[PDB]
Amino acid sequence: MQIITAEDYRLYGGLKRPELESGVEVMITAANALITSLLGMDDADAVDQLITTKPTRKKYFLSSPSATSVTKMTINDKEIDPEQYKLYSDGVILLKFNPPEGYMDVEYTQGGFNPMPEDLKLAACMLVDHWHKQDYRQARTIGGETVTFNNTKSGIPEHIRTIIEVYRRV
Amino acid sequence: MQIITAEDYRLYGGLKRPELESGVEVMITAANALITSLLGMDDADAVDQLITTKPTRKKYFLSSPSATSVTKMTINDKEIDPEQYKLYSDGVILLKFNPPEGYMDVEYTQGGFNPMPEDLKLAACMLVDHWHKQDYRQARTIGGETVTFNNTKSGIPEHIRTIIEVYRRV
Amino acid sequence: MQIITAEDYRLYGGLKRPELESGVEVMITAANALITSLLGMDDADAVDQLITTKPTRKKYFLSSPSATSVTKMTINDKEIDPEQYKLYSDGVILLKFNPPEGYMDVEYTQGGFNPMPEDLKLAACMLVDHWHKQDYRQARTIGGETVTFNNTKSGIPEHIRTIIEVYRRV
Amino acid sequence: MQIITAEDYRLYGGLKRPELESGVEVMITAANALITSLLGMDDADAVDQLITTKPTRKKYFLSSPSATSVTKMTINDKEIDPEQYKLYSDGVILLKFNPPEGYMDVEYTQGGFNPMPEDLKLAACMLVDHWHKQDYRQARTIGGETVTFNNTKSGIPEHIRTIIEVYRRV
Amino acid sequence: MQIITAEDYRLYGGLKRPELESGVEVMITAANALITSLLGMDDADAVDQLITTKPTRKKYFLSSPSATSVTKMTINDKEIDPEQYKLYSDGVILLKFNPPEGYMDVEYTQGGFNPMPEDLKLAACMLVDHWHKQDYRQARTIGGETVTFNNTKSGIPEHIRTIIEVYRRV
Amino acid sequence: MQIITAEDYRLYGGLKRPELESGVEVMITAANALITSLLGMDDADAVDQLITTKPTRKKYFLSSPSATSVTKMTINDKEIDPEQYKLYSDGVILLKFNPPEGYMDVEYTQGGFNPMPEDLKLAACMLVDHWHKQDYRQARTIGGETVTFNNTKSGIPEHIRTIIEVYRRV
Amino acid sequence: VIGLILETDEILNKKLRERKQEELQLDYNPSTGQSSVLILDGGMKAKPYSQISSFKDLDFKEDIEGFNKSICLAFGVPQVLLDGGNNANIRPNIELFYYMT
């Protein structure tokens, strides 16, 4: 996805200089990719899937909880009418009939976070700050001033970790 | 939700200055979103839900404990009259009849914290203060003055944690 | 509840200044809300409750241990005469007859701490001082003077914790 | 109860000044309430109680071990003559007959510590001293002089704790 | 793979010097090889594989989850028509017929990360900086300035570790 | 194997001096031998091996996963035609017939890392640097400058350890 | 079903890892293989795992027998006629079945 870019990164901090340094753009794009990868999302217009179909099961789960619609469905090389299934608010799909055994092929259109939450923007901005200023040490001191940094959970700091884990199943 | 905004943030601290810095508004909005996300609410006028119905069960729980009213109810593609249920103080729904098996679809209207509690406002103010002044380190020493910060519970500090967990099931 | 307000907060500290800084009133109101929320109480004139009725059980407990009176009781859509029950000192309700199965709906009026105990006032004053003076760190050293703070029990300090837990089931 | 008041607080710590500071009276009253609450007592002239009555049981325990007398007794809505029970030194009540099943309603007059023990007065005075001088930190160093305070048991310090537990079931 | 090269390494940092020290190119190539070896990839145009075939199994997984197409498949020295199978989005291969026992030989063409993710480039830049500046000690103190480094997970630092383990099964 | 020699060692660091010191060549050759020994290889043109043969087993593993071809195979003192086996990408050998019991003798030609990986070259260069500069102590302090070295895994440092264990099964 | 679980804290070359997975499984089977002793070098450990869901908790004999007996009861056929037994079990049960049902 595209979380921050130069305008939001500038608004987060106070830079007044003419332009972001060459290294800053790479870090911003890297954070944009890394967060959307950590949240379980995958940048793709449409996704093809295998959901195993057992009888007496009428509730199948799509991979992306943010599936807008299902273009087509095929069970055992046989297409199914749009009136035999209903896609609810989540990826949950309900089948009115009893599906036969075999395999299921579903094509859906994925769309996530059309209005972008500000929590993810803050998390990405502070990740960019973490990479830019090398605040990835256990301790540091330049003369009088000493700094001891936070504990890390799977590498990322605690605050970015809590924001991600708030949004970490999409 | 909108918990704090500029006026309440100004009242919490003492700012004589003309105007909040550009980075402060982003942090305020991010705190507004994170708090309303951590407490379990979801910003939405109406929510569609699947509550599975078993026989000899007449007490079903809505997702939001702050549901004002139920617009319609549908059990197995059959609507239910308003006189067969009545919504109590919480999201609890009591069914006078014995529901058949299958699935149930309920559409309700959410309303949360019309009088905004001051505890959540203080929590948001102290969160945005936590972000603004970079008080997310284990310790810090600027010359003579030394500060050792509190322990963290799932990232957020202890005080914000206790306020949230006081309100963390809505 | 309304525990402290400006007069009692002034009578604790002893301040001589004309007024209370704009931030102090917000902290006082937040402490008033937080304590009445932590004690298990709920600001409400009347509360509707579901208490399930099994046979050979003639002792049901109301939600609030400080219920002044019961306005109305209805078992299985049938009202009950006031002479078939009487509410004791606590929320305990004894039913002279054998209640049928089903559900019970009780409406009662809450009254809590008409004479306000001084313990809660001291706890709230300590909380507002704790928030005002940022005394929520593990240690602090301003020049020669060093202060190491107490351990925290679910965030709140030890003294406020003991006062609350003395009153924390109302 | 009323343990200390201004005269006893003054006698505890010799003091020359005209009158106790405004904050000191609030702390004294708060300690007076807190100690009598911690010792299990309850300020009340008369107390109504439910004691479950099983047959072959002729020894029922009153709530307050300092019950002066029992005004009336009613078992299953039937009053009982004063010659059928004897209230001994403690709250223990002996029934000459075999009580029937059901429920028991006893009204007694509570009176506790007519001669005030000096241990409770000392405990309350030192609690007031603990609150007045903010001796509720783990350590403190004002220049050369350093102080490390005692361990806490459920918040209150060790000495106040042991005095309370000496008197903590009345 | 080829992740960084001189242009990307220059863009990550700020270098105005004419060229890259002779040692820097070796470290860049070493990082390029090390990352593509750690993530489970293998630089190869085509790969021959043994996938054992049991009956009533119609789902076989290829070695590389990024297999573009299958050129040829041979079950027990007998070629299979292209219409008896079709390769899905991942390396998953479904066989329409029931395969006999024995062994299967499949030739496929690997294609990996045609658009290079920026996370891997950032990780490689961090690795080459880690090798160039000898920042692989537990602590270091040059005069006043002291630096204490992060914990290591299987040798590589925490941030590179998290990026790799985000991409470490391809 | 020959991983480094003087040219690659010079390219790793920056040496403008005429010629490597006499002790450096010995350390380079020792690193060359230690790495090729640790990764499980053995410098040899051809290797004779006893692979025991049980019936109903047609998949035998050669000692070296980098065997180019098998010159001769003999089961129970009986030579076997080249058409009864064909050597796959790894050392895996598939026998078309059912081998009799007894013992089986294979003569193959080993070839390992014809294109030398840069990871092993960097590991060897940093090993010889580790030996030359006596960086095999827990800590060291020359005047102001203090260095605390990494933890060791089976003697070799963490970084060389991770590179080796990436390549340590050949 | 699992036979051996080996754990390491480093990234040891997925391809040769799978090769060793095949090799150990082939070698240590007593039907096709002649090895019994394992030496773990380089720091690799062995996790003493157990079995979570076994086939001994699924005791379905009594329920199935009850269902069969109840069906035979519903139709009226004595169980001895279906199973078979001694003469005193054979003839009176035949007479009871025919007559009563």
Q: Could you explain how this protein is built, in words?
A:
- The structure is cut from a larger assembly and holds six copies of chain A (170 residues) and one copy of chain G (101 residues).
- Chain A is an alpha+beta fold and 170 residues long.
- The longest helix of chain A is centred in the N-terminal third of the chain and has 17 residues.
- Chain A contains four helices and ten strands.
- In chain A, a hairpin with a 4-residue loop joins strand 4 and strand 5.
- Helix content of chain A is 29%, strand content 25%.
- Chain G is 48% helix and 4% strand.
- The longest helix of chain G is centred in the last third of the chain and has 15 residues.
- The radius of gyration of chain G is 28 Å and the shape is rod-shaped.
- Chains in contact: A-B, A-E, B-C, C-D, E-F, E-G, F-G.
- Chains A and E meet through helix 2, strand 1 and strand 7 of A and helix 1, helix 3, strand 8 and helix 4 of E.
- The PDB classes it as viral protein.
- The entry lists the keywords Complex, viral protein.
